[PDB]
Design a binder for these strands. Structure first.
Lengths: 178, 184, 184, 184, 184, 184, 184, 184, 184, 184, 184
DNA sequence: CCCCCCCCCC
DNA sequence: CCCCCCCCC
């Protein structure tokens, strides 16, 4: 099962080679600072290891503070996320979540907690190689990214989008799996 | 049993391909936020049915690791409640994803309904955010702004109608009863 | 034993198909839920019988992970009580779904009746919300507003009558007793 | 041993069939509730014997997960006590159902007797509500509003008589001792 | 060992039949309750002997899960003590039943004797109520009001006399010592 | 080892029969209660010897689950102490019986003697009450009022004399040493 | 190893026979209680050697489950200390007996010496009372008043003399060392 | 699985030799301390990639045993935060090294960013110091003063340029998917 | 390994015989207690060597279950410390003996030395009292007053001198290294 | 895996011989203590490399059992911090050594840097002292005063130069990667 | 592995013989202890080397069960610190010895140095006293007063000189690496 | 009510 | 939107 599977030579070789790849400009985004968006990291991990080849859990989440300054809330929240592969290999790291200025205590806490968990997951997956987000920390890679042409955001083709719940091929394979 | 079943090549490959699909406009809904901005989301029951179809009714599981009420404040007769929950989804092979949901209830005068609303919302949100990590088909694509742009350019479709003619009308499931009798 | 048996292909397919079924109007009832509007729901005993038919009396299980009384407040002689419960349903293959229920009692003068109402409602609500996660047939469809529109357009049927002629009248079960004697 | 035995096809089907039965009027009793209304219920010993017949003396089990005294109040010499209990019933195959019972005692001048009544009543109620989840035959049908009306239309029968001629009069059980000696 | 032995068909059926037996008048005793009314009961030693005969000296077991002193109050020189106990009986196959006993001592001037009486009574009562759940032969029939009337209609027999001629008079048990020597 | 050995048919039946025996007058002792009534009991060493002969020196065991000093009060220079103990007896097949003992010391001026008396008495009483549950031969019959009447009508026998001619006089046990040397 | 070895028939019967023996006057010692009455007891080392001979140096074991200092009081320069200990003896077959010992120290000016005396006495007394439960040969007979009377009528023998001619004078044990070298 | 793999002779020897290598100037960075002096270090991503190449992406793992915030102080509008972390790295053969990292933030006006900086720095520092213990190739050589001197004498090379032509541009990994499909 | 080995017949009997031996005057020492009385004891190292020869350096073991400082008092400039320790000796067959030692230091002005003395003495005393329980050869006879009288009648011998000519002078143990190399 | 491997004769003998070697002056360093004196020590990275060469990168491991900050004092604006750490080193055969390290930081005005220095120094010192216990080669000889005098009499060598020509300049390890590919 | 290996006859006998050896004057040193006179002791590194030679680098292990700082007191600028530690030594066969060490620092002005001295001394002292229990060769004889007298009569030899010609000069151990390479 | 407990016991 | 008044008395 999970945590018991040992990587075969072919799969080990494919993943080890693939994880060295640096990410193209399609993955990187910027704010006012470069970063990779959460769903992109999720999709990267799902493609690298399979939907059932990686796992993550929240070891502990701790609210550092909730302060009130003339009607505005300032909240800091840390989270400890541990990623595990289907072979037992694991990486655990710290994420943080901040919410300053909001008037809603509850919305501030929601933003801070969710942000902390997502950040922790990104930083835990980072430790597997450049393909999962390590290259973003290399300043030479950032410069080589700035010299690249700023391409416009690609468009998504919703023609083959999932339109009904049923997955007939999946149901067939699962019925044949028993 | 559960957590021990190992995925066969056919089911693994089918699921891996199927999870890449982004969701059509049938799944996505929208509300208005505190900044007057549009926020998309998938309704709970849609995600539950999506997961039941992707993994089988017995191929996925979820549990509440911890639910914690952050605060209960009383402002001139109105209750403001924040509740977080940690939901862990597991597949029949032991693979798991755990995330946090939050639940908010501001303005209500009934403390009990505020707490109920916050707790249930927190748990459902945590389940959705935990299931997100399995792929676009279970809700990962909703975070892609390009997917959102491609969704607005689409015609606002009218609510589909449900045909309740073959709806279940009595408890017994005879084919199910036979299949189970033959299992003992 | 329980939690160890793996579903056979025939029973898996039967149950997966049956769980997709939406519920007819015989199951749906209405009360005034949280929010003060008319809200549809499935009665507890109906969900119990639904689950017993879907999985068998020994094919599903549930337990109360934790029940916590959030508060008991007294406002000029009336009691206001909120109670949450965490109920986890498990199938005979180890598959599980856990959710939160809440129980409310505001205004009553009897503390004991208020607490009893809140605790029992919390447990039953948690069980229903945990069973929701297996498919439409166990209560997931009730959350689809399109399903509600398709339910209102249906002819309002009168409550069916129960024929108590073949009702159980003595304790002994000879058919069961024989199979059990031969099972040892 | 217990929790390990798997139900055989014959015993499973027999029990699944028997549990669908609604109960005849011999089981149901009634009192006058709060608002000058009628409320039906099944007495504890009836449910105990029903379970012993359905599963065998060694085919079902129950335990008290937790009992918590909610309150003990003193108003001018009278004690008012509320007690909840969490009872978990388990079958010989590991299947389980857990629910909450409550126990109330208002008016008594003895704190000890109030607590005794409340605790025992809570536990018995919890056992009844836990056994309810196995099917109609163990008490689920009592929740059906149509079933109660269909029960009122039957002629109210007078208490059947019990013939104590074959009552056990001395301790020794020779057939049991013989089979048990043959068990070694 | 204990909790592992599985009941053989003959012993299962013998015990299942024997537990249906209602108890004769030799077992029932009576005291007066608070409202000056008759309350029936089975004495502790009677239940112990019944259980030893039904299952064997090594076929049933009981343990005190938890005992909690609810209160010890002093009212003008008299002590009033209430004590609850949770007793769990288990059979040699792992089957179990757990229930609550209570112990009361009101009026005594000695705290120590009040506590002793309350604790011991709680434990014994809990054992009786746990054994009750196996069937009429172990004490369930005492709860049937119809069974009680048929007991009043019976002639109250004078206390049976005990023939102490075959009483054990010295420690050695040669047949037992021999059977055990042959076990090594 | 202990707790695993399963009783052989011969030893089971021998012990089951022997435990039914009531005790002769050699075992019973008496003290006086204040109301002019007589209270019977079996002395500690007598119960220990009874158990050693019934089960063997290595066929029964007991342990102190918990001992709790309820109170130690000082009233005008005199100490009044109540102590409870929970003793669990276990047989070599895993069968067990657990009960409560109490120990009392009122009036003594030495706190140390009060505590020692109460603790030791509690433990011994708990052992007696736990062993009682195995049958009449180990002390259950002492609670039967008819057995008490049949005991009082018997001629008061003079204290038996002990023949110390074959008493153990030196440490070495040669037969035991030889049997154990062959056991390695 | 220890706790797993099962007693062989020869050793079981030999030990069972030997444990029935009462002790001669060589073992019994006496002091005067605080009320001028005669109190018998067995010295610690005598009981230790008794157990070593009955079961072997490696056939019995004991451990201190818990030691609790009940009180340490200071009255005009003198310390009064009560300490209880719970000692559990176990045989190589898993059989066990647990009892309580007490240790007292009144009058001493040194708190440390008082505590040392009380703790050591509590533990030794607990070991004696735990070993008592194995039979008369290990100290059970000391509680029989008839044995005490038969002890008084026996001639009080003068303290035996110890022959230190065959005493161990150097550390080395050549026979033991040889038997052990052949054991590897 | 992980923690079970034993290093093969070829892989052990390869890694043992490779870890002896000291690092070239491409890895080392430097800053100025609070007292105007040069401090060398290895950046986090370099250590992560070094370890991934030395042991494989699945041949090393690390976990946070505990993170403890030492202090958060507010001095006239500036926050000073010290946080320690204990990081444990493990290899696929069970070999492990655990060390401490620290995180500092002095002067900042935002508490949230101070805490984020201190916690993340503590964890990364602990990871670097834990990996340091495996050899020079993973960072031990940075502590050799002679290695630092021999590094300064080297020509300061210009920052290398990165060729992003072969960068990953889409999610799909066909070779990886193929090998994994062949792994089921 | 340790705790698992079962004693072979030869070594068992050798040790069983050897443990009966009383100790010659070379082992016994004496001090003067507070009442000017002669108190006998065996020095620690002698008991350690006794055990090392009786069971082998690897045939017995001891551990400190708990050490508890009873008090540390400061009375007019001097420290008075009492410390108890619970030492459990175990043999290579799993047999064990646990007892309490005490350590005292009264009068010293340095707290640190008082604590050191009390703790170390408590541990050593506990080890001596635990080893005593195996038989006379390890110190049980020292408690026999008859043994003490038989010790006084012997001539007080002068301290034996130790021959340090064949003393160990370098670390290496060549025969040991050879035997160990041949064990791998 | 780790903790399971048994040392082969060749590797055992090699390591046992190698650990006796004392360290040359290349390893030893010196500082000035509080009395203007010479204190010798081995720098951390040297000890890490020593252990990695003696046992292999995967043949030794260490963990931090506990680190405890003893004190943080503020004396006229400067911080003085003492921190202890407990480091446990384990070999691939399960052999282990645990010792204490300390860390000090006096004079700094930054609390965070003081704590960082003290914690890191404590952990490194504990690792050095734990590895010391394996033999002279890992640092035990540094405690021999004769070793120190014989160290002064040797010619003080110039700091060796480091040859960075073959330093690792890129991440990939082709020999390691190939040896690992052949291991799956 | 460690804790599982059983000693072979040859190695057991060699080690048992070697442990009897008393130590020559090369090992013994003298300082001013808590008795206020010339007190003999074995230096830490000597005991470590003794153990490494007696059992092998991988044949003995020790751990710190607990270290507890008893007190830190400040008297006119000087610190008085007492620290105890519990060290447990174990051999490769599971045999173990656990004892207490103490560490003292009185008079020093630096709190950090006092705590460091006390903790390290406590751990080292505990290790020495735990190793004492294995025989004279590891330090038991140092307590023998006759051994001390026989040590004074020996010629006081001058500090031995160490031959550092074959001192270890580089990290690599080629023979060790070869023996390990062939072990995989 | 009473008995348990008060007075006695150490 | 609930909460209040209703319901339990």
């Amino acid at each position: 099962c999970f945590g018991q599977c040992q990587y075969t030579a072919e799969e080990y070789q494919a993943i080890q080679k693939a994880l060295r790849q640096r990410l193209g400009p399609e993955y990187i985004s910027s704010r006012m600072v470069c970063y990779i968006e959460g769903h992109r990291v999720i999709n990267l991990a799902n493609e690298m290891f399979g939907y059932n080849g990686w796992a993550h859990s929240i070891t502990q989440q701790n609210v550092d503070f909730v302060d009130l300054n003339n009607g505005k809330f300032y909240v800091g929240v840390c989270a400890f996320v541990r990623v595990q592969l289907k072979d037992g290999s694991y990486h655990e790291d710290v994420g943080y979540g901040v919410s300053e200025g909001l008037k809603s205590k509850a919305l501030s806490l929601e933003k801070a907690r969710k942000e902390a968990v997502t950040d922790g997951l990104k930083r835990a997956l980072r430790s597997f190689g450049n393909a999962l987000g390590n290259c973003i920390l290399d300043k030479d890679y950032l410069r080589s990214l700035n010299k690249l042409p700023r391409q416009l955001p690609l468009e998504v083709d919703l023609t083959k989008a999932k339109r009904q719940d049923l997955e007939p091929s999946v149901e067939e394979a699962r019925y044949n799996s028993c």
